[PDB]
Amino acid sequence: AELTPEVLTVPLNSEGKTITLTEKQYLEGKRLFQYACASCHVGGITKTNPSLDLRTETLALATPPRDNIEGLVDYMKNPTTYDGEQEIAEVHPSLRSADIFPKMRNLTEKDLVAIAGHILVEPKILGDKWGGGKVYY
Amino acid sequence: ATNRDQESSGFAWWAGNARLINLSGKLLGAHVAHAGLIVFWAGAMTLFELAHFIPEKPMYEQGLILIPHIATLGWGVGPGGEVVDTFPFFVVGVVHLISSAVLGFGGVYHAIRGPETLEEYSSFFGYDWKDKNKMTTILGFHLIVLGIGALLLVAKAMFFGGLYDTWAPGGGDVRVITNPTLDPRVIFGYLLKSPFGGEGWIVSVNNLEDVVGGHIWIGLICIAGGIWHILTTPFGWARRAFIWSGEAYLSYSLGALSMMGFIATCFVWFNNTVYPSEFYGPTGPEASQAQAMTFLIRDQKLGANVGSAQGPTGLGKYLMRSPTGEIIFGGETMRFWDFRGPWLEPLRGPNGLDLNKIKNDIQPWQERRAAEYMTHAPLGSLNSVGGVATEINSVNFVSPRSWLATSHFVLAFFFLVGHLWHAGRARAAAAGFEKGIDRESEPVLSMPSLD
Amino acid sequence: TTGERPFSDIITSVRYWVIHSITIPALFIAGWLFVSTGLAYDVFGTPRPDSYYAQEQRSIPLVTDRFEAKQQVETFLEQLK
Amino acid sequence: ANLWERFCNWVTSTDNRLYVGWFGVIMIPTLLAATICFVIAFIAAPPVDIDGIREPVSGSLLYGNNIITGAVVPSSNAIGLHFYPIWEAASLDEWLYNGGPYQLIIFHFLLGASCYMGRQWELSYRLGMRPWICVAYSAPLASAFAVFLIYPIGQGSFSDGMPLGISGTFNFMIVFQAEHNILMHPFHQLGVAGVFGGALFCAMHGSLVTSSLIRETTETESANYGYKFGQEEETYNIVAAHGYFGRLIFQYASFNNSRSLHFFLAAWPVVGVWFAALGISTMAFNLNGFNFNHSVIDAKGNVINTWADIINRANLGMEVMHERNAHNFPLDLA
Amino acid sequence: ERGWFDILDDWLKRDRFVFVGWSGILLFPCAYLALGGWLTGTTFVTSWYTHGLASSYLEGCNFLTVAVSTPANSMGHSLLLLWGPEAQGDFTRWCQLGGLWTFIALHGAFGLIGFMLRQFEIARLVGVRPYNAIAFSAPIAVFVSVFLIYPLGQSSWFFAPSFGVAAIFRFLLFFQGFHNWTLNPFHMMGVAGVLGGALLCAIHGATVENTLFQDGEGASTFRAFNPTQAEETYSMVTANRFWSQIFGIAFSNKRWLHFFMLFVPVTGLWMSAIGVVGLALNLRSYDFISQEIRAAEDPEFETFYTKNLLLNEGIRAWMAPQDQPHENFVFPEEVLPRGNAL
Amino acid sequence: METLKITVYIVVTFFVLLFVFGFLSGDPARNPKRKDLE
Ligand code: CLA
Ligand code: CLA
Ligand code: CLA
Ligand code: CLA
Ligand code: CLA
Ligand SMILES: CC1=C(/C=C/C(C)=C/C=C/C(C)=C/C=C/C=C(C)/C=C/C=C(C)/C=C/C2=C(C)CCCC2(C)C)C(C)(C)CCC1
Ligand SMILES: CC1=C(/C=C/C(C)=C/C=C/C(C)=C/C=C/C=C(C)/C=C/C=C(C)/C=C/C2=C(C)CCCC2(C)C)C(C)(C)CCC1
Ligand SMILES: CC1=C(/C=C/C(C)=C/C=C/C(C)=C/C=C/C=C(C)/C=C/C=C(C)/C=C/C2=C(C)CCCC2(C)C)C(C)(C)CCC1
Ligand SMILES: CCCCCCCCCCCCO[C@@H]1O[C@H](CO)[C@@H](O[C@H]2O[C@H](CO)[C@@H](O)[C@H](O)[C@H]2O)[C@H](O)[C@H]1O
Ligand SMILES: [Ca+2]
Ligand SMILES: [Cl-]
Ligand SMILES: [Cl-]
Ligand SMILES: [Fe+2]
């Protein structure tokens, strides 16, 4: 098995446009995810709130949908609760809250795309392991 | 080659440094060269830390143990422990590194070039281990030096910028200490606290006024005793109780260092005042309490009445009573209810955690701080996979508190072994049987049989 | 002593090092090339990183018969496209 | 000859059947207290709420235990590291419920055993011996400190101290593997080499000396009567032993110096057990064994399992089942 | 009669740097091949087709995780000869099917026989009693019971220990979860023998070193000993008085002392071997029936015995699907035993 | 419980003093060889 362009092709937006990441983007997304996100999200779960995971099926049913690049990039700028009703920048890392989450200060727009691409590609590789927790270790 | 082989000295090569016992000049060289190594490491390690340091990451995510020591003293940091200026870290490293060349130079000179013995050269720098007067005088000088060192910390705190105060109103900040605690009932009352849970002996010091005032007392005490030991000679009761020899003196210091290493191990594990969690990461108690707080907050936001939620055991799922009645966090963290920290004390009332404050006054910065500390608990593998032993690879993390506590327990243990080794040997050498039993004089042969 | 030349004699002799300054690196380089040419994989039947699985499968090619085990492995190897 | 000097001369006398000495003055009462409490508690103590969840565990013989399952149960998790002498309880019945006896036993035992180590130094001084037998005893002594005191301190509770029982020991070991992966820690591995090697060199030295006993007896009598207590001459031929063992391996792999041979016999297990003690003592601060979970990844990024991942599955099973009612939140952080 | 047999005997028994002997004809090829097979396998050979595991340096494993793994369960107890009906002479297939495991195990068994014959042979030539060989029966009993008898009682070689560090750790944990092996009194005796032997090693070595006679002037006491001296180098009388007054009892017979040091670890290993023979048949010390009857009926009855069985139950359910891939266990999340929260 | 506490405090203090005064009582000289150690 190989990391092919098929694997690296993910939804860009809700209208069905796709974008194909490079292997360098994917690996950059993994490094930046570890840098800024894995302390709570290792393996696609959420340690401080295990009810919400990073499975694509879970992201598809968020409001607004987060199962694509634009939704995930928007989440990292201005995160909301699962139903979209509330803005949680004050307790979740984002560009809007880079003053209180200093690791977000040196993330650029290009970095957000790569992190987003990692989150969308990893389940295509790991299957149930992604967001499955210890049962699938 | 004076005393530089086994036949002349009686010591094999693997005990070669024992050949130095009565060669004060080379022994001086060895000690000065070695201090140069200590100062070298401090300087070089700091520079390595600085080169590898990203100011946007918490120190505790970066494998730093020296910069946190400097930051705690009030250099380079501002409110909340944010790094505002890395130049002080640079200075501290460079100056230690440059100084190590001076110490290395003197050490190499005295070790191989200078006079091997100092008694012929200078009666002031010369010494005999058995001269109780000279030994207490040398001890007296070094007590005065140590006492000055303690007063430098006071001067830093009161006159040269202050100290980083994790408890400062508004999130932690550098603060000048204007009223150090001088009341000896407070300062010495720390020494008589039990070392067990909820008391914690001196590890429990929780405010900078006590820290600074304790160093004033220690500075004076060391200077006074240093003068005392210059002017006096050991009394008769002391003379009869001790062994007076180089190895014996070494053994006493090994005992002392082992004890200090064990205390340092607990200090860094439990204390979050002189080891601020901003720089070192949360303590183990702290991260465990932070998890209870995180899920209390999450569930209360979902509509749970956390005060009346009965857990599976019948004890409260979120809150319960300590054995003396205080309201505390539930679950396995019941063991950690003695934890105090700036992010938690606003919820504390006279009876412990206050349900009204919990319901109404939890600020977003507290939720942030608890989620950060819960996810940087001091658990991790030897290859620096952060988390419980069953976690997958992803997070490269081992808390500085674990690094500092494990290393100093190991060092303290071996220094206790060294004390036993050298105290037992000093006693035997003084009495004259450290090389074996004299066949013609075997003591047990002159004793009555046991039965 | 048992008659053989002492080891300390041999390994401080120029002739020993004239010989072994060649034979030691030559063996090392042969071992390096055994891997770098990919020959080790084929001698022993060890998967390369891209041959543990087919592109979309997640099942192990586990041997399940005693006397057709050889053919089972060959069949698993075909199915790698 | 005043009464204090008389007392000191009796205390330090080399003529007592059992040496007392100054360490013995602390040793004797603390070991007696710990022994008496242990025996009574092992037989008759009521169940103990070890994990603080009002779920008492029965440890004594009268309450349904045999020799293998019985234990003196660690004190309650609700107490953590607080000091719990009898006089801090409102009654003996409270003290028993909360595992009071555990604290009394281990504190008196650790004091008594530290003084046992001092007593070994002390008698060697009175007899004109070299001083370091007590340094060998520091290795088992450090190990007891590791499981009764140091590990409780790092984890914040004497309830995670080792129970004083056979099956209690096994419980402690299994949970330790789940929470620290001790099998993958090099200090436990050095400890295994210490005690495996200690047992190997024990049988080795025993077999070699026994193999080279000098014929002094007939076949109908025990060869042990060929040695006489106090005799001046060695009872075996070390040259024949060295000649056998040097040929078994090669000549330079064998000892012909009895003094360095016996030093090696002392050092190997003592150093290994030191490392074992330090493993427990440093995993007390959660610096755990090597973690290679999902370390091997294929070209696509599939996880390729190693034996390390199979170990992890076993550790998870121990993790999720231990103390099954004691955790309300998803991470077992202590 | 000085025929070829006696001339060969002459050459085999020459006093050389490495003694050879008749025993050496068995010992050296078998020991060399078992070691060479382990190094070859841990460096280059996979366990993908037998276990679903990477297991070689080539694949990225390290010293702790490499192994030569057991064959697949479907091989049964096949000798797995290179020329046998499974591999059929194909060296690559043989490696993939687990032929290196039986190769190492069988050459290792015969190497161990050869080492023990070497101990007899050299002892007979030098003129010493053969107690070193007798003591070596204990490592042989352990090797044969764990690597041969145990899997022969089970379904296949697959359940034997695999030859690697972490693979052996998995073997320890399997024995706790499935066999409750810590509860077994034959293991308990083995533990006593091994820890007691380590204890005797430490205490005897320390006692000799601290009752030495001053037989020289140096502070390094090692030089003051001559292998041909007739005198004891340490005081048995002083040693005996020390331990009598510290511990109550002491050795007084030096021959008994060194026989005892042989006896204790050798007997311990032999006892552990017997219990493992029982486990070959699943004849475990798993339960105490009296405890189970009480606990079934009285849901307030809890002991460290019942606590450990719950741990075993966790080990079995959580490790079995990955550890026994040929069984095809599919355990949905909802059937997995778990405590609260974890 | 208070009587128990005072008793233990007194007992422990008694044995500790014996230990300290014991080793203060010329202990280096209590060996079979050289007494003159001071
Ligand atoms: C911190 C570690 C340390 C220090 C400071 C010393 C110091 C000393 N050792 Mg000890 N020793 C040590 C560790 C140390 N040792 C260790 C680990 C072992 C076991 C191997 C020994 C075993 C041992 C034996 C057997 C002996 C000593 C002896 C000595 C003394 C004389 C050495 C000599 O004459 O060499 C001469 C060597 C040289 C001239 C070669 C180079 C030496 C220089 C100093 C190298 C320094 C390089 C440095 C980069 C230059 C910086 C210059 C710059 C600052 C300007 C000296 C005071 C001797 C002694 O006791 O004499 C009475 C002796 O016989 N040692
Ligand atoms: C300030 C601390 C201190 C000082 C000044 C001394 C001084 C001395 N010791 Mg003592 N000792 C100490 C602490 C100290 N010791 C401790 C903490 C222990 C317990 C381990 C000992 C145990 C001990 C024993 C058993 C003996 C001494 C002896 C001696 C004398 C000869 C030392 C020598 O030449 O070693 C030479 C140095 C070496 C041979 C090198 C040792 C190498 C170490 C083990 C490597 C450790 C690994 C390292 C930390 C990390 C790995 C590095 C690697 C990756 C490169 C000398 C008076 C001897 C004596 O009694 O003489 C009177 C003796 O027999 N010491
Ligand atoms: C007080 C001692 C101490 C402590 C607590 C730390 C802690 C740390 N170091 Mg530092 N460091 C130290 C001393 C220390 N160091 C010394 C002496 C050096 C010079 C060698 C360094 C040079 C250094 C570098 C270059 C780096 C670190 C790094 C780190 C971090 C990662 C450590 C790691 O992964 O270890 C791995 C674990 C081991 C190697 C285990 C060592 C096992 C030893 C050999 C056992 C010894 C036992 C005993 C001493 C011997 C007894 C023998 C017996 C016979 C008596 C961690 C914060 C890393 C970092 O993150 O920097 C920001 C990094 O890159 N350190
Ligand atoms: C504590 C360490 C120490 C001690 C006790 C000594 C002691 C001695 N040295 Mg050595 N030396 C040392 C370290 C030490 N030195 C260092 C670090 C170096 C490199 C600079 C040297 C280089 C050196 C040389 C080249 C010579 C000596 C000589 C001597 C002898 C005569 C010195 C004298 O009379 O000065 C009189 C006192 C003074 C001049 C006062 C000096 C005040 C200093 C420089 C200012 C700082 C004081 C302050 C406390 C420093 C704090 C440092 C701290 C932060 C680390 C004497 C035995 C001489 C000798 O061996 O004769 C044969 C000699 O020729 N030393
Ligand atoms: C490095 C520090 C240091 C060292 C090595 C010494 C060493 C010495 N001092 Mg000096 N002293 C010092 C600092 C030091 N002093 C300081 C800072 C002062 C000013 C306060 C003094 C004031 C002083 C006086 C007035 C006297 C000495 C004396 C002595 C000599 C006898 C020591 C003795 O018997 O202790 C043994 C300790 C005791 C007997 C204390 C009682 C025993 C208790 C019960 C032990 C408790 C241990 C326990 C674990 C404590 C844990 C912490 C605790 C606080 C809770 C010895 C040479 C004596 C001497 O001969 O002077 C010429 C003497 O009369 N010293
Ligand atoms: C005696 C003896 C010994 C020891 C020795 C020693 C221990 C020595 C020491 C030494 C030392 C201790 C030395 C040091 C030196 C130092 C130096 C030489 C430094 C320099 C520095 C510099 C040059 C700097 C630079 C810089 C800067 C300024 C800035 C930043 C960057 C950099 C870093 C580049 C031995 C054991 C061997 C043996 C024999 C005898
Ligand atoms: C700084 C500080 C502080 C303070 C501190 C202090 C004030 C301290 C003190 C300390 C001290 C003050 C200590 C002491 C110690 C002591 C010791 C450690 C002792 C010892 C002793 C000994 C060891 C003895 C011995 C012996 C005996 C017993 C018998 C006879 C003989 C002899 C002598 C051997 C505080 C906490 C506030 C806060 C923080 C900071
Ligand atoms: C199987 C087989 C065979 C055989 C083969 C062989 C015989 C091989 C050999 C092989 C070998 C013979 C190999 C070897 C290798 C080696 C190595 C790989 C080593 C390494 C080492 C190291 C790495 C080291 C390390 C260390 C230590 C351990 C300690 C000290 C320090 C150090 C760090 C140095 C035949 C063909 C018959 C047939 C088919 C099957
Ligand atoms: C809480 C701990 C308090 C520790 C207090 C430390 C204070 C130090 C003062 C110690 C008092 C000096 O008094 C000390 O005791 C008595 C006095 O009868 C003597 O006691 C001893 O003397 C000699 C020592 O050579 C012995 O042979 C003899 O058996 C014994 O009588 C000590 O030699 C003396 O040194
Ligand atoms: Ca003086
Ligand atoms: Cl449990
Ligand atoms: Cl919990
Ligand atoms: Fe012996």
Residue numbers in the entry:
A (entry chain V): 1 to 137
B (entry chain C): 23 to 473
C (entry chain E): 4 to 84
D (entry chain A): 11 to 344
E (entry chain D): 11 to 352
F (entry chain I): 1 to 38
Paper's wording?
Photosystem II (PSII) produces dioxygen by extracting electrons and protons from water, which takes place at the oxygen-evolving complex (OEC), an oxo-bridged Mn4CaO5 cluster with a shape that resembles a distorted chair. Here we use pump-probe serial femtosecond crystallography to reveal the structural dynamics of PSII from nanoseconds to milliseconds after illumination with one flash (1F) or two flashes (2F). We identify structural changes associated with electron transfer, proton release and water delivery at various regions, including QA–QB, YZ, the OEC and the O1, O4 and Cl-1 channels.
Large difference densities appear on the QA side at Δt1 = 20 ns and Δt1 = 200 ns, become weak at Δt1 = 1 µs to Δt1 = 200 µs and vanish at Δt1 = 5 ms. These changes correspond to the formation of QA−, the oxidation of QA− to QA and the completion of QA− oxidation, respectively. The formation of QA− causes the counterclockwise rotation of its head group, concomitant with similar rotations or movements of D2-F261, D2-W253 and D2-H214, which surround QA. At Δt1 = 20 ns, two negative difference densities first appear adjacent to D1-Q165 and YZ, and at Δt1 = 200 ns, pairs of positive and negative difference densities appear over D1-Q165, YZ and D1-F186, indicating their correlated movements towards P680. These movements might be in preparation for the subsequent electron transfer from YZ to P680. Notable positive difference densities first appear on Mn4 and subsequently cover all four Mn and one Ca ions at Δt1 = 20 ns–200 ns before OEC oxidation. Nevertheless, metal–metal distances remain largely unchanged, suggesting a possible charge rearrangement on the OEC triggered by the electrostatic effect of the oxidized YZ•+/YZ. The difference densities near Cl-1 are observed when YZ is oxidized to YZ•+ at Δt1 = 20 ns.
